[PDB]
Curated annotation (Swiss-Prot), chain B:
It is found in: Cytoplasm; Nucleus. The modification Phosphoserine is found at S237. PROSITE patterns: PROTEASOME_ALPHA_1, PROTEASOME_ALPHA_2. This is Proteasome subunit alpha type-3. The modification N6-acetyllysine is found at K51, K200, K224. One of its GO terms (cellular component) is proteasome core complex. It comes from Homo sapiens (Human). Induction: Down-regulated by antioxidants BO-653 and probucol. Up-regulated by bacterial lipopolysaccharides (LPS) and TNF. It comes from the Eukaryota. One of its GO terms (biological process) is proteasome-mediated ubiquitin-dependent protein catabolic process. Its main location: cytoplasm.
Swiss-Prot record, chain C:
Its main location: cytoplasm. Phosphorylated on tyrosine residues; which may be important for nuclear import. InterPro entries: Ntn_hydrolases_N (IPR029055), Proteasome_alpha (IPR050115), Proteasome_alpha-type (IPR023332), Proteasome_asu_N (IPR000426), Proteasome_sua/b (IPR001353). This is Proteasome subunit alpha type-2. Component of the 20S core proteasome complex involved in the proteolytic degradation of most intracellular proteins. This complex plays numerous essential roles within the cell by associating with different regulatory particles. Associated with two 19S regulatory particles, forms the 26S proteasome and thus participates in the ATP-dependent degradation of ubiquitinated proteins. The keyword Nucleus applies. It is found in: Cytoplasm; Nucleus. One of its GO terms (biological process) is response to virus. The modification Phosphoserine is found at S4, S11, S13. Belongs to the peptidase T1A family.
From Swiss-Prot, chain E:
The lineage of its organism: Eukaryota, Metazoa, Chordata, Craniata, Vertebrata. GO terms for cellular component: ciliary basal body; cytoplasm; cytosol; extracellular exosome; mitochondrion; nucleoplasm; nucleus; proteasome complex. Induction: Up-regulated in fibrolamellar carcinomas. It comes from the Eukaryota. This is Proteasome subunit beta type-4. It is linked to Proteasome-associated autoinflammatory syndrome 3: An autoinflammatory disorder characterized by onset in early infancy and recurrent fever, nodular dermatitis, myositis, panniculitis-induced lipodystrophy, lymphadenopathy, and immune dysregulation. Variable accompanying features may include joint contractures, hepatosplenomegaly, anemia, thrombocytopenia, recurrent infections, autoantibodies, and hypergammaglobulinemia. Some patients may have intracranial calcifications. PRAAS3 inheritance is autosomal recessive or digenic. The modification Phosphotyrosine is found at Y57. Belongs to the peptidase T1B family.
Curated annotation (Swiss-Prot), chain G:
Keywords: Acetylation, Cytoplasm, Glycoprotein, Host-virus interaction, Nucleus, Phosphoprotein, Proteasome. This is Proteasome subunit alpha type-7. PROSITE patterns: PROTEASOME_ALPHA_1, PROTEASOME_ALPHA_2. Belongs to the peptidase T1A family.
Length: 233, 239, 229, 240, 212, 247, 232, 146, 233
């Protein structure tokens, strides 16, 4: 009944629609692109005090100039991230250059939706990935922010929010974001919105923030830096 | 739920999936083919779904081999797939045996390929009917038709599509066994115009092809001048 | 490509209904009998054709497997042919390796494993057939039965098919340890006669024997011969 | 009696009584064509006769045929679904050619029927594909057994015969032939053709003309399978 | 083919104003034996392309069957597109190189002449995938004997007429017959122009002076 | 096809493997098999379910299979499935012997088979092996041993256990009257007879419905025996006398 | 090759096969693990000794390597398969990297294996959750937990299996630097937490202790009883 | 259709159907009372009721084509004040897989939309809005399609 | 409701519902137009953005120096088809050193797209294409459907609200053959404008143009590159 590769009356694949629905269960993640750089923020959503917050890695580095923020079924994103890292290093090995953000997003998106049941592979993926990824990095075109959905559709975005509070996080980003915004303003704005949407009180231990700038490589803020920014925020 | 697969017989011994495939073939525009002494002639009622389509778009007449023609009805996508199969069968025959494939053999091979798709649930029956025509001095004119179930027979004049019955009635009065391709072309055009329904469908374009002694045994489109004469004759006949 | 999932699955109470139904088909089949005498074995079956048109000698039910093994069935005819071919194949494979005729017990085990595979493999139904195998190895007669489920038993005398309950009850009353092959053949024919519904003729039944000489199907002359007594 | 449990009526799996409903429907499909065939064995000949219905003049009657030549000395007649019968005919030709190539002598009719029966039996055991809804009858001359007539059905049953029918009126033909077979010999001469044509003409009440039946014969003197021409068929029809 | 069995000798080609002409003798040598003396080694690829070949004749026949089949397939579509001499030359180079790479070469040296879009084409293809286009070509012993004559004339006169090219080819064919031990006196001339491809019958090198 | 698939390797709403649960319920009806571990040996006692005047006596046992020079097993469930697993057990044990030139320890052999069963319950789309087994053997690592396995692929070592019909009553009795660490092969045999006597409510011990095999070490070599009719009857008679003397 | 999609999404974005696998973990016996200053302790409640079972062959605590061990809660057969896969990987990591595995690495390997079975064709999710404890080469104690979904985290102290909510609630209130001050105090914390659910105590709980340099050690029944006596 | 079932209630309607069959054709032929019958389903009708002596002319009523849709909309817009801009051909092309009832709904909804807007005469935009309303299409809260 | 769950299941009316739904997917897509003249073939597409801060999704892709496509439907399927077309064009150039004729490329697409529509467990390609190319036979415009059918057109439009566009193209079809490149593009833009929902105008941010000609390799105009064409409408 209702095979995976099935079309609804409105032409929308059932599995993709359900996978997109699974994204709303993830924690909020925000990414802002500025001429100075790109910043990624994500709520860690600690379940119990006995859990070690250092073990929740919702922001990972693909390469020295690429960073990814995840939301949804975090276990699914592991294979997508591994593919992105491998693709980036293969490109350097072959062309002795650094892959652009769009090309990395394109390679990952192609991997997504390559699921099937009959005449696909001995162990091909049986379902789409239930994760939405935010790719941030700096390339020959400068800072770049890309959003990828379970449907394999990716698009560049100046500022994008994903997760359980995407509706309302995007609303706030609409009012505040502007083209000439600096990296410091972007980090402050991202934290302000995150504090608003988060159910728990925002502190330096329950959020993750990383930035990529033309000069420096992918950088994940430590507690000391996080405490500094939230104090003003 | 006895009609959901081609690998289940109905209680009375019927494969409904095959029957539904024929039903799809019965919604297409009619296409006829008449065998004569000199050769074979094909005709198709191509409806113009939109005025934005180029003349010759979605052509329903194919050359499976340099001496064999092919007319189709029903789902066009399936028809093109079968035409590719027929070309593959014809090409493989020449490489292995070294001479043009007889039309009877080609029809048998394609019919068995079609029949193989009405035995398993892993595939579905081709929803299209088509007819093969050719002419050789040794074998003479030959015309065949194949249905979704995979059945192939020789014909003197065949019809497939919406107005199959009306076309068959018209074909009955031609006496094609002692006529030439030049005269048959006009008759083929006349029949198509009569069966066509101008009230229901907006407009159509007549596609003609033939193979015989006059073409030296090579299937080809009828020349534009001859087609114009046939169309004028058919229109004049429809007084 | 072929279904990869088993069609035989456990029921809530723990029964394999598909194996249960395969036995029902065997039960409704034609009666069969096998008796292990003191110096040989005998297999018999009913071969009642539908009308005079069928050729009685066209197809045999008591088919040899080797020079010393033969078998008969009760169930679907087409499935019997498949198992007979596999049984002959297995017997030759054994001989090629060991340069010795396959012992009756070994052949039964290998044939049983084949039938078991069809109760677990994907996209297949069980063999709706029960086999009786007779043999003579190491100076001793053997009689085995092998059911659709793939289980096999060693019998001194048994019956299968329609009214096999009465056939076994009959055999129990009449059986004796020290019987002779002639008395075994006579009893086997009578067992069939218990539920036959008509006049038994040399063309309406089939018999085969196995002894020190080897397995061989009795000719219609002999079958009529025994019938007369 | 007709209890159902699961998909026993949709695939080839045992019914509660131990039945294969899908196989039974394949038998019921043999009667969709509406035709009947008869095969009778003579003292030194074998004959197969079947109907021939051309629905309209447009059809090329030459191509409409149910008699096929498997090899030089073997011929067959098919009934039931048209497409299914042709596919089985192709397989029989391939199997016969393979036998000749491998073992160095022509394939006996019984062995050819057995091979086709084994192929059919696989269809009723495996659930991926349905059984062919067609029936085959084979006739040939054995080297040391005289004429042979064999028939195989969708289930895989392939018993030999002396007289046989297949199709819409199989029951009536079987009774007619059995009565004739009982009397003296079911014909014991090359005019066994007359017995067959009479049997077919009796059940359907047709009074055939030369262009409504086709006949194929094999004789000990001339073992090659032949299809009698419309002229020869007319000669037999007038004689009877 | 690891070892050729029946082989054809040199093939000549030269392009003139408005066409190309190719020559080759009708002889299949089985290792110093004029075994088959009536085999044509020139093929009409299509309406504007012709092909001569040297080396193993069986491999040439195989390419005849394959190339002939492709042309048939393209004509079946009837879409107004046909293979040009350059396209066929490119296809042959890839086919020959691929076989060489797999270590199962087609033991042949082919000359492709054609005329399309008012431009003449003349190409060369070896068994190892070497290919190029030149005003004149000569495979086998034609490279040593016939090529010097053709090159000398063409350098003097870049553009030739049909009659001049034909006479030049006949002179070269005469020289090859004199000095080539695997040559034959009967040969064919194929010409491609705006009017298509024409193959001339079994011509003979009648002019053979033997003043000894 | 999805429609006809049974989905034999999925989870139930309450996280249960129904096919494994049904298979275990199938074993609950098969003949009773009993295993007792003693100080100087192990034994297996099985209810010979087949009982008919016409059945012949072939092979050395009906439910007790020899796997090695120092191992044996009994089965309860689908007989055909048991034959498949017993053959695999013999192959696994010989493969180990080929690799290491030492007999396979009993625990390793059980684990290897249980791995096969577990795979059937996880992937493949096939029905599980509806069989439960009892193993007895000796090895240089742990001496005499007794193991049990289930269709789920789960196993455990026991000092005395039962599986099959009336397993609950059999284990309840064994638990009460088992003297851990102080049982000889003779008290173990007597305990097996008493347990079988009550577990088989139908009739009493006729010495024909019972098959007993014992494993012992003699002169440094493992010995596996199936008790004959004369000795099995002698045990039953002694049990009858003791039961009489008690009353 | 059976290649049906066992695990698929559902309306509202749920993987019922993963959720069912979780309810299968919940039916299993309780298991507790705490990370001490210089010791990591694993505890587990025994449903019933039965007085006939050989306790040696029913251990729910296993050693993946010399520096890593784990305890599971769920299907016993599934755990045995996962444990074996980890054991071969630990040896493989030793062969290539030439250093002992880290608790995070092996936890990541096990979690990835579980995630793969939730997205593969013709496969059932693993019905177990594991608590992996050990010491990294640096000497820092580690404690990780893995779910059938394929997610994993690092825990100061966590419990899995039946009644895990109450044990976790008890641990949250009773976990402090003072409680884990000494090795004996850490052991008592695990025993007290287990006693929150299990009834008998002492005779119904199994304990395993891992120290920095020493290998895995299983507390004897006498030691467990003594700790229980000291607790009361 | 008549079936051999143990459930009662259906047998009474079967008896009424048999009486109707006899009245339509049977003893005492009738030549002064004609019959017209309408059915949404013909796969369930009894063969004796679909016979050639009772229901001879079985007329099929297909879903309208483009021209039929245009004619239906014109017919039902005859009485309304419609502007001379409406492209009934475009409406027919855009109302694929509709029936006459749905086309009537399109027209009446266009009129009601005009009334809501406060307009004296209808317009092509009103007709398109009515088509959208009659289609009864729901949105999935996102439109990630290109 | 049992005949619309598989692509190998015919319905009683001789229709495959799965194919019908796939055709319905392209309808939900965004509009795009394609027309040809005696010398040029033009593609104009209307891009739309999910959010105001997200870049408009690209709709025109390169295939070869003489072929381009405009997509409308599932982007992931579009990339799979675009990748197949590029490989086919590359293989023709590698083997025959000649551009692949547009019609032969379209025939290959139909053959590939037909296979999924006849096998169990497979699905149709949920994407429609407007192929514009130039070959030895002149400019070409083709239309592809999720059902493996294609039409050689002279002016076609697909996507949401594309019937208003098709109405314009038919009305002015008589002028396309003899118009200049500037005039031809304006015709494509005017049709696309009709599709637009009243209170909205064509902008450099949502209009993308693709042109191929006799002496003009396929080029894509986006952003400010579109301003010259829009100036005048």
């Amino acid at each position: 009944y209702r095979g995976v590769n099935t079309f609804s009356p409105e032409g929308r694949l059932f599995q993709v629609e359900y996978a997109i629905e699974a994204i709303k269960l993830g924690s909020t993640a925000i990414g802002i692109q500025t001429s100075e750089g790109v910043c990624l923020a994500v709520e860690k959503r600690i379940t119990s005090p006995l859990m070690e917050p250092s073990s929740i890695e919702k922001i990972v580095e693909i390469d020295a100039h690429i960073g990814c923020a995840m939301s949804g079924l975090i276990a699914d994103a592991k294979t997508l991230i591994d593919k992105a890292r491998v693709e980036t290093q293969n490109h350097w090995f072959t062309y002795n250059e650094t892959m652009t953000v769009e090309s990395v997003t394109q390679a990952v998106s192609n991997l997504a939706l390559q699921f099937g049941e009959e005449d696909a592979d001995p162990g091909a993926m049986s379902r789409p990935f239930g994760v939405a990824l935010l790719f941030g990095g700096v390339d020959e075109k400068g800072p770049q922010l890309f959003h990828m959905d379970p449907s394999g559709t990716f698009v560049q975005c100046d500022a994008r929010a994903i997760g359980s509070a995407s509706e309302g996080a995007q609303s706030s980003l609409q009012e505040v974001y502007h083209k000439s915004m600096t990296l410091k303003e972007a980090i402050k704005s991202s934290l302000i919105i995150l504090k608003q949407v988060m159910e728990e009180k925002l502190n330096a231990t329950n959020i993750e923030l990383a930035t990529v700038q033309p000069g420096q490589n992918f950088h994940m803020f430590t507690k000391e830096e996080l405490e500094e920014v939230i104090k003003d925020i | 739920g006895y009609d959901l697969s081609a690998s289940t017989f109905s209680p009375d011994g019927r494969v409904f999936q095959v029957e539904y495939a024929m039903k799809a073939v019965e919604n297409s525009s009619t296409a006829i083919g008449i065998r004569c002494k000199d050769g074979v002639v094909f005709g198709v009622e191509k409806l113009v779904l939109s005025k934005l389509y180029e003349e010759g778009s979605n052509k329903r007449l194919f050359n499976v081999d340099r001496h064999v023609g092919m007319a189709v009805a029903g789902l066009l996508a399936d028809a093109r797939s079968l035409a590719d199969i027929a070309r593959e069968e014809a090409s493989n025959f020449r490489s292995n045996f070294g001479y043009n494939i007889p039309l009877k053999h080609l029809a048998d091979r394609v019919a068995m390929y079609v029949h193989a798709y009405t035995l398993y649930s892993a595939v579905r029956p081709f929803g299209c009917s088509f007819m093969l025509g050719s002419y050789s001095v040794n074998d003479g004119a030959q015309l065949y038709m194949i249905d979704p179930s995979g059945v192939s027979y020789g014909y003197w004049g065949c019809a497939i599509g919406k107005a199959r019955q009306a076309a068959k009635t018209e074909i009955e009065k031609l006496q094609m066994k002692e006529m030439t391709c030049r005269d048959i072309v006009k008759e083929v055009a006349k029949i198509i115009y009569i069966v066509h329904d101008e009230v229901k469908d907006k407009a159509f374009e007549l596609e003609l092809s033939w193979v015989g002694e006059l073409t030296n045994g090579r299937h080809e489109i009828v020349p534009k001048d001859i087609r114009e004469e046939a169309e004028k004759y058919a229109k004049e006949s429809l007084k | 490509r072929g279904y990869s999932f088993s069609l035989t699955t456990f029921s809530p109470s723990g029964k394999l209904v598909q194996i249960e139904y395969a036995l029902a088909a065997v039960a409704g089949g034609a009666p069969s009998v096998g008796i292990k005498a003191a110096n040989g074995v005998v297999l018999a079956t009913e071969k009642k054709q539908k009308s005079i048109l069928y050729d009685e000698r066209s197809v045999h039910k008591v088919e040899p497997i080797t020079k010393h093994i033969g078998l008969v069935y009760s169930g679907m005819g087409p499935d019997y042919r498949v198992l007979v071919h596999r049984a002959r194949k297995l017997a030759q494979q054994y001989y090629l390796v060991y340069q010795e005729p396959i012992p009756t017990a070994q052949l039964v085990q290998r044939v049983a494993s084949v039938m078991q595979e069809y109760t677990q493999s994907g996209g297949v139904r069980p063999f709706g057939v029960s086999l009786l195998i007779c043999g003579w190895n190491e100076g001793r007669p053997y009689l085995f039965q092998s059911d659709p489920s793939g289980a096999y038993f060693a019998w001194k005398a048994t019956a299968m098919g329609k009214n096999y309950v009465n056939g076994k009850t009959f055999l129990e009353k009449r059986y004796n340890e020290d019987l002779e092959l002639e008395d075994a053949i006579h009893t086997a024919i009578l067992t069939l006669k218990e539920s036959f519904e008509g006049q038994m003729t040399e063309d309406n039944i089939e018999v085969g024997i196995c002894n020190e000489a080897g397995f061989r199907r009795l000719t219609p002359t002999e079958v009529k011969d025994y019938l007369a007594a | 009696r007709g209890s159902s449990a699961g998909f026993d009526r949709h695939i080839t799996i045992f019914s509660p009584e131990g039945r294969l409903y899908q196989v039974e429907y394949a038998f019921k499909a043999i009667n969709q064509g509406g035709l009947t065939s008869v095969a009778v064995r003579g003292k030194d000949c074998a004959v197969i006769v079947t109907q021939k219905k051309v629905p309209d003049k447009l059809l090329d009657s030459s191509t409409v045929t149910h008699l096929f030549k498997i090899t030089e000395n073997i011929g067959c007649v098919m009934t039931g679904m048209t497409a299914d019968s042709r596919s089985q005919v192709q397989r029989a030709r391939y199997e016969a050619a393979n036998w000749k190539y491998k073992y160095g002598y022509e394939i006996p009719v019984d062995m050819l029927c057995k091979r086709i029966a084994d192929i059919s039996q696989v269809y009723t055991q495996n659930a991926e594909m349905r059984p062919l809804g067609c029936c085959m009858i084979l006739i040939g001359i054995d080297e040391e057994q005289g004429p042979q007539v064999y028939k195989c059905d969708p289930a895989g049953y392939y018993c030999g015969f002396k007289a046989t029918a297949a199709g819409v009126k199989q029951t009536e033909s079987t009774s007619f032939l059995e009565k004739k077979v009982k009397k003296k010999f079911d014909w014991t001469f090359e005019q066994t053709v007359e017995t067959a044509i009479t049997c077919l003409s009796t059940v359907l009440s047709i009074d055939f003309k030369p262009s409504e039946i086709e006949v194929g014969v094999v004789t000990v003197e001339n073992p090659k399978f032949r299809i009698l021409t419309e002229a020869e068929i007319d000669a037999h029809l007038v004689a009877l | 083919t690891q070892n050729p069995m029946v082989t054809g000798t040199s093939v000549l080609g030269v392009k003139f104003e408005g066409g190309v002409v190719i020559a080759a003798d009708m002889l299949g040598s089985y290792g110093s034996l004029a075994r088959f003396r009536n085999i044509s080694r020139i093929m009409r690829v299509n309406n504007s392309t012709m092909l001569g070949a040297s080396g193993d004749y069986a491999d040439f026949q195989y390419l005849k069957q394959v190339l002939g089949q492709m042309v048939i397939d393209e004509e079946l579509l009837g879409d107004g597109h046909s293979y040009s001499p350059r396209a066929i030359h490119s296809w042959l180079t890839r086919a020959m190189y691929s076989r060489r790479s797999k270590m199962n070469p087609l033991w042949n040296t082919m000359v492709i002449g054609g005329y399309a879009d008012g431009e003449s084409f003349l190409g060369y293809v070896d068994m190892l995938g070497v290919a190029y286009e030149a005003p004149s070509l000569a495979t086998g012993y034609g490279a040593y004997l016939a090529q010097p004559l053709l090159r000398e004339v063409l350098e003097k006169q870049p553009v030739l007429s049909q009659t001049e090219a034909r006479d030049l080819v006949e002179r070269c064919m005469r020289v090859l017959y004199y000095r080539d031990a695997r040559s034959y006196n009967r040969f064919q001339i194929a010409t491609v122009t705006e009017k298509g491809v024409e193959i001339e019958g079994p011509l003979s090198t009648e002019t053979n002076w033997d003043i000894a | 096809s999805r429609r006809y698939d049974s989905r034999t390797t999925i989870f139930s709403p309450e996280g249960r493997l129904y096919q494994v649960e049904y298979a275990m319920e199938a074993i609950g009806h098969a003949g009773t098999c009993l295993g007792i571990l003693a100080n100087d040996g192990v034994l297996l006692a099985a209810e010979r379910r087949n009982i008919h005047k016409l059945l012949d006596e072939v092979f050395f046992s009906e439910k007790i299979y020899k796997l090695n020079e120092d191992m044996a097993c009994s089965v309860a469930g689908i007989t055909s499935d048991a034959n498949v697993l017993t053959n695999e057990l013999r192959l696994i044990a010989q493969r180990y012997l080929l690799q290491y030139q030492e007999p396979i320890p009993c625990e390793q052999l059980v684990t290897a088979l249980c791995d096969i069963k577990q795979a059937y319950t996880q992937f493949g789309g096939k029905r599980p092996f509806g069989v439960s087994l009892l193993y007895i053997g000796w090895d240089k690592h742990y001496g005499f041993q007794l193991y049990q396995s289930d269709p789920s692929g789960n196993y455990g070592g026991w000092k005395a256990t039962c599986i099959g019909n009336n397993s609950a009553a059999a284990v309840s009795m064994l638990k009460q009257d088992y003297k851990e660490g102080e049982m000889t092969l003779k008290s173990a045999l007597a305990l097996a007879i008493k347990v079988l006597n009550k577990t088989m409510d139908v009739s009493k011990l006729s010495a024909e419905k019972v098959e007993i095999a014992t494993l012992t070490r003699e002169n440094g070599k493992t010995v596996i025996r199936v008790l004959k009719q004369k000795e099995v009857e002698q045990l039953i008679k002694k049990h009858e006398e003791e039961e009489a003397k008690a009353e | 090759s059976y290649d049906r999609a066992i695990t698929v999404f559902s309306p509202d974005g749920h993987l019922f096969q993963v959720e069912y696998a979780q309810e299968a973990v919940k039916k299993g016996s309780t298991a507790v693990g705490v990370r001490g200053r210089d010791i990591v302790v694993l505890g587990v409640e025994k449903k019933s000794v039965a007085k006939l079972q050989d306790e040696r062959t029913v251990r729910k605590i296993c050693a993946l390597d010399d520096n890593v061990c784990m305890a599971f809660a769920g299907l016993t057969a599934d755990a045995r398969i996962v444990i074996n896969r980890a054991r071969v990987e630990c040896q493989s990591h030793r062969l290539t990297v030439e250093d002992p595995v880290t608790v995070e690495y092996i936890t990541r390997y096990i979690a990835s294996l579980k995630q793969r079975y939730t997205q593969s064709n013709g496969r059932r999710p693993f019905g177990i959750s594991a608590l992996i404890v050990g010491f990294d080469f640096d000497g820092t104690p580690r404690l990780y937990q893995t779910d059938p979904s394929g997610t994993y985290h690092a825990w100061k102290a966590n419990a899995i299996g039946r009644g895990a909510k109450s044990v976790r609630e008890f641990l949250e209130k009773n976990y402090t630097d003072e409680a884990i001050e000494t090795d004996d105090l850490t052991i008592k914390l695990v025993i007290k937490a287990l006693l929150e659910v299990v009834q008998s105590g002492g005779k119904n709980i199994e304990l395993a202790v891992m120290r920095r340099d020493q290998s895995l050690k299983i507390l004897n029944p006498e030691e467990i009883e003594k700790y229980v006596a000291e607790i009361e | 259709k008549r079936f051999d079932s143990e459930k009662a209630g259906d047998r009474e309607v079967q008896r009424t159907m048999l009486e109707l069959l006899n009245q339509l054709d049977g003893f005492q032929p009738n030549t002064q009372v004609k019959v017209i019958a309408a059915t949404n389903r013909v796969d369930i009708l009894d063969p004796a009721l679909l016979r050639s002596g009772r229901l001879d002319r079985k007329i099929e009523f297909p879903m309208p084509n483009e021209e039929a849709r245009a004619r239906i909309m014109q017919i039902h817009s005859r009485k309304m004040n419609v502007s001379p801009d409406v492209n009934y051909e475009e409406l027919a092309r855009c109302t694929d897989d509709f029936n006459g009832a749905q086309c009537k709904a399109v027209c009446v909804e266009a009129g009601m939309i005009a009334l809501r807007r406060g307009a004296t005469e209808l317009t092509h935009e009103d007709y398109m809005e009515g088509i959208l309303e009659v289609q009864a299409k729901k949105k999935a809260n996102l439109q990630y399609y290109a | 409701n049992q005949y619309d769950n598989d692509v190998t299941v015919w319905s009683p009316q001789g229709r495959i519902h799965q194919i019908e739904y796939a055709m319905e997917a392209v309808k939900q897509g965004s509009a795009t137009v394609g027309l040809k003249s005696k010398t040029h073939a033009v593609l104009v597409a209307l891009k739309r953005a999910q959010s105001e801060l997200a870049a408009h999704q690209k709709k025109i892709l390169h295939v070869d120096n003489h072929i381009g496509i405009s997509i409308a439907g599932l982007t992931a399927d579009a990339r799979l088809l675009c990748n197949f077309m590029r490989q086919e064009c590359l293989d023709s150039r590698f083997v025959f050193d000649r551009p692949l004729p547009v019609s032969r490329l379209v025939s290959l697409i139909g053959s590939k797209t037909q296979i999924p529509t006849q096998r169990y467990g497979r699905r149709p390609y949920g994407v429609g294409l407007l192929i514009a190319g130039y070959d030895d036979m002149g400019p070409h415009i083709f239309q592809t459907c999720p059902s493996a059918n294609y039409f050689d057109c002279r002016a076609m439009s697909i996507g949401a609200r594309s019937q208003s566009a098709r109405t314009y193209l038919e009305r002015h079809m008589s002028e396309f053959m003899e118009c200049n490149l500037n005039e031809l593009v304006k015709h494509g833009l005017r049709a696309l404008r009709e599709t637009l929902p009243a209170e909205q105008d064509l902008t450099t941010k949502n209009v993308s143009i693709g042109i191929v000609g006799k002496d003009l390799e396929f080029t894509i105009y986006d952003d400010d590159d579109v301003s010259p064409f829009l100036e005048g409408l």
